[PDB]
Design an enzyme around this catalytic site. Structure first.
Site, PDB file in Angstrom:
ATOM      1  N   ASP A 191       0.914  -1.053   0.021  1.00  0.00           N
ATOM      2  CA  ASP A 191      -0.119  -0.052  -0.123  1.00  0.00           C
ATOM      3  C   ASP A 191       0.760   1.199  -0.106  1.00  0.00           C
ATOM      4  O   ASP A 191       0.512   2.395   0.684  1.00  0.00           O
ATOM      5  CB  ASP A 191      -0.977   0.138   1.223  1.00  0.00           C
ATOM      6  CG  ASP A 191      -2.244   0.934   1.090  1.00  0.00           C
ATOM      7  OD1 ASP A 191      -2.496   1.463   0.066  1.00  0.00           O
ATOM      8  OD2 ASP A 191      -2.800   1.293   1.920  1.00  0.00           O
ATOM      9  N   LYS A 207       2.726   3.357  -5.839  1.00  0.00           N
ATOM     10  CA  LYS A 207       2.207   2.470  -6.941  1.00  0.00           C
ATOM     11  C   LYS A 207       3.067   1.783  -7.811  1.00  0.00           C
ATOM     12  O   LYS A 207       3.267   0.632  -8.182  1.00  0.00           O
ATOM     13  CB  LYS A 207       1.041   3.095  -7.375  1.00  0.00           C
ATOM     14  CG  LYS A 207      -0.074   3.805  -6.566  1.00  0.00           C
ATOM     15  CD  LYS A 207      -0.334   2.632  -5.122  1.00  0.00           C
ATOM     16  CE  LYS A 207      -1.402   3.074  -4.270  1.00  0.00           C
ATOM     17  NZ  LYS A 207      -1.242   2.599  -3.007  1.00  0.00           N
ATOM     18  N   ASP A 240      -3.344  -3.229  -2.365  1.00  0.00           N
ATOM     19  CA  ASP A 240      -4.461  -2.011  -2.342  1.00  0.00           C
ATOM     20  C   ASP A 240      -4.437  -1.297  -3.701  1.00  0.00           C
ATOM     21  O   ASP A 240      -3.296  -1.203  -4.187  1.00  0.00           O
ATOM     22  CB  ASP A 240      -4.473  -1.302  -0.983  1.00  0.00           C
ATOM     23  CG  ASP A 240      -5.913  -0.407  -0.750  1.00  0.00           C
ATOM     24  OD1 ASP A 240      -6.756  -1.010  -1.528  1.00  0.00           O
ATOM     25  OD2 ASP A 240      -5.993   0.293  -0.022  1.00  0.00           O
ATOM     26  N   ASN A 241      -5.335  -0.540  -3.704  1.00  0.00           N
ATOM     27  CA  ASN A 241      -5.624   0.437  -4.989  1.00  0.00           C
ATOM     28  C   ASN A 241      -5.051   0.063  -6.375  1.00  0.00           C
ATOM     29  O   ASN A 241      -4.305   0.682  -7.086  1.00  0.00           O
ATOM     30  CB  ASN A 241      -4.817   1.649  -4.662  1.00  0.00           C
ATOM     31  CG  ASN A 241      -5.373   2.374  -3.187  1.00  0.00           C
ATOM     32  OD1 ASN A 241      -4.502   2.658  -2.309  1.00  0.00           O
ATOM     33  ND2 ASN A 241      -6.562   2.472  -3.196  1.00  0.00           N
ATOM     34  N   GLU A 250     -15.682   6.289  -1.898  1.00  0.00           N
ATOM     35  CA  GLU A 250     -16.678   7.162  -1.792  1.00  0.00           C
ATOM     36  C   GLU A 250     -16.153   8.639  -2.693  1.00  0.00           C
ATOM     37  O   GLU A 250     -14.922   8.989  -3.012  1.00  0.00           O
ATOM     38  CB  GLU A 250     -16.928   7.746  -0.331  1.00  0.00           C
ATOM     39  CG  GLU A 250     -17.721   6.575   0.350  1.00  0.00           C
ATOM     40  CD  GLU A 250     -18.138   6.854   1.889  1.00  0.00           C
ATOM     41  OE1 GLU A 250     -18.324   8.035   2.086  1.00  0.00           O
ATOM     42  OE2 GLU A 250     -17.930   5.986   2.664  1.00  0.00           O
TER      43      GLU A 250
HETATM   44  N1  SAH Z   1       9.151   3.416  -1.187  1.00  0.00           N
HETATM   45  C1  SAH Z   1       8.553   3.392   0.013  1.00  0.00           C
HETATM   46  N2  SAH Z   1       8.734   2.773   1.030  1.00  0.00           N
HETATM   47  C2  SAH Z   1       8.007   2.841   2.203  1.00  0.00           C
HETATM   48  N3  SAH Z   1       7.139   3.683   2.429  1.00  0.00           N
HETATM   49  C3  SAH Z   1       6.560   4.345   1.311  1.00  0.00           C
HETATM   50  C4  SAH Z   1       7.302   4.462  -0.035  1.00  0.00           C
HETATM   51  N4  SAH Z   1       6.572   5.069  -0.749  1.00  0.00           N
HETATM   52  C5  SAH Z   1       5.696   5.598  -0.018  1.00  0.00           C
HETATM   53  N5  SAH Z   1       5.601   5.093   1.298  1.00  0.00           N
HETATM   54  C6  SAH Z   1       4.572   5.501   2.079  1.00  0.00           C
HETATM   55  O1  SAH Z   1       3.317   4.773   1.737  1.00  0.00           O
HETATM   56  C7  SAH Z   1       2.111   5.351   2.411  1.00  0.00           C
HETATM   57  C8  SAH Z   1       0.963   5.254   1.337  1.00  0.00           C
HETATM   58  S1  SAH Z   1      -0.481   5.383   2.292  1.00  0.00           S
HETATM   59  C9  SAH Z   1      -0.544   4.138   3.394  1.00  0.00           C
HETATM   60  C10 SAH Z   1      -1.841   4.083   3.746  1.00  0.00           C
HETATM   61  C11 SAH Z   1      -2.279   2.861   5.005  1.00  0.00           C
HETATM   62  N6  SAH Z   1      -1.594   1.527   4.494  1.00  0.00           N
HETATM   63  C12 SAH Z   1      -3.351   2.965   5.573  1.00  0.00           C
HETATM   64  O2  SAH Z   1      -4.302   1.781   4.996  1.00  0.00           O
HETATM   65  O3  SAH Z   1      -4.013   3.707   6.224  1.00  0.00           O
HETATM   66  C13 SAH Z   1       2.527   6.885   2.895  1.00  0.00           C
HETATM   67  O4  SAH Z   1       2.919   7.065   4.292  1.00  0.00           O
HETATM   68  C14 SAH Z   1       4.295   7.179   2.229  1.00  0.00           C
HETATM   69  O5  SAH Z   1       5.179   7.999   2.938  1.00  0.00           O
END
Ligand code: SAH
Ligand code: K
Length: 218
Positions: free
Chosen positions: A140, A143, A168-169, A198
């Site tokens: 998550d 992407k 996810d997503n 939503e």
């Molecule tokens: N290469 C990487 N390694 C680790 N964390 C990363 C990353 N790229 C982005 N992130 C982190 O990934 C997160 C995505 S949002 C995660 C949402 C969480 N899983 C939930 O369900 O609430 C962010 O906090 C971002 O800082």
């Protein structure tokens, strides 16, 4: 102004019940719904996540991307005594909020927040963190790293036959290259789950991809 992250933690501390993970989840979702932060309302994807944890009862889970700790609380609340969630988070400020969130939930002992980029931390799991293989991985984070980090997990020997990946997503904003890989590969058996967002009023989804072991060396 104030970050989303600090406001989410504030809302939890003011409205949820300490040591009641369900109340923490519900508070986050209530607040994020009110703010119309579509990607931060987790209850729909949470139904799917809960069913995965309940079916497979993983002892060691890796999460990529913690944010404020919603998914870490969601998963850790269903893990058994002595089980472990490792969550990788590149932004220290998010790691900090996640830590505070877990403390409020009473689940901090089940979770280890690893502060760094997944691409840097994954190769350290075996030797620095004494990992054999993961039972489950929740993807998550960024992407464009879903497919690269899956390949990295494979190469580092962190997946075994039966390891469950849950991503996810995969539809919005989408991870089409990841999907094409796991769906097309004999090394993964895949299932898709629809999950509504939503405001955008769109059907996103999660992909479950169960590793089958490596392809033949020949
Ligand atoms: N290469 C990487 N390694 C680790 N964390 C990363 C990353 N790229 C982005 N992130 C982190 O990934 C997160 C995505 S949002 C995660 C949402 C969480 N899983 C939930 O369900 O609430 C962010 O906090 C971002 O800082
Ligand atoms: K496949």
């Amino acid at each position: 102004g104030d970050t989303k992250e600090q406001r989410i933690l504030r809302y939890v501390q003011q409205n949820a019940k300490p040591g009641d993970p369900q109340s923490v989840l519900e508070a986050i979702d209530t607040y994020c719904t009110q703010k119309e932060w579509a990607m931060n309302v987790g209850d729909a994807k949470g139904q799917i996540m809960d069913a995965v944890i309940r079916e497979y009862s993983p002892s060691l889970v890796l999460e990529l991307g913690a944010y404020c700790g919603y998914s870490a609380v969601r998963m850790a609340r269903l893990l058994q005594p002595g089980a472990r969630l490792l969550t990788m988070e590149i932004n220290p400020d998010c790691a900090a909020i996640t830590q505070q969130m877990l403390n409020f939930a009473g689940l901090q002992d089940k979770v280890t927040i690893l502060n760094g980029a997944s691409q840097d931390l994954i190769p350290q799991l075996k030797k620095k963190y004494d990992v054999d293989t993961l039972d489950m991985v929740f993807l998550d984070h960024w992407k464009d790293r879903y497919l690269p980090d899956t390949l990295l997990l494979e190469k580092c020997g962190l997946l075994r036959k039966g390891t469950v990946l849950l991503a996810d997503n995969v539809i919005v904003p989408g991870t089409p290259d990841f999907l094409a890989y796991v769906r097309g590969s004999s090394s993964f058996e895949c299932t898709h789950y629809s999950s509504y967002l939503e405001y955008m009023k769109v059907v996103d989804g999660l992909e479950k991809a169960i590793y089958q072991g490596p392809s033949s060396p020949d």
